[PDB]
């Protein structure tokens, strides 16, 4: 099963590295939880809606890419804080993501919709405190996201070319990218979120 294979990929990496990623998520969540979980959730919902509305309208150009990544990093930091500390807030964020995934599927962005389904599942594992289950589902969500970029690479061929080795390398390559590149960037998202308050 995709979940079993991705999980196997996650377990092949050193425990210390996985523990670092987990500890980093929790520290970011505590930093954001200091600002009120209701406020964190409200901001998360606002940013999620903005990003989705802009995306569907095709107003994200290649020139726009650095700013959107920053907005996503903030959104993920806020959402993760909510997943750790508020079931009700989490339920609202998840409900919205399910609607977005359905809409994207109806629009034919099927891989992106699948990526979002797996993000939703990862957030539920995060809420339950399952670090390995979280990293497994997050790896699948990133893999599907990159696959979406490669299948749509006509929109940014260079970006497709950059992430293609990750797709060709499978869940192991995606997990490797996460541990070595993505997880350290979480702090960047947290800092931008702090600035918003």
Numbering used by the authors: 2 to 198
What sentences appear in the manuscript?
Here we present rotamer inverted fragment finder–diffusion (Riff-Diff), a hybrid machine learning and atomistic modelling strategy for scaffolding catalytic arrays in de novo proteins. We highlight the general applicability of Riff-Diff by designing enzymes for two mechanistically distinct chemical transformations, the retro-aldol reaction and the Morita–Baylis–Hillman reaction. We show that in both cases, it is possible to generate catalysts that exhibit activities rivalling those optimized by in vitro evolution, along with exquisite stereoselectivity. High-resolution structures of six of the designs revealed near-atomic active site design precision.
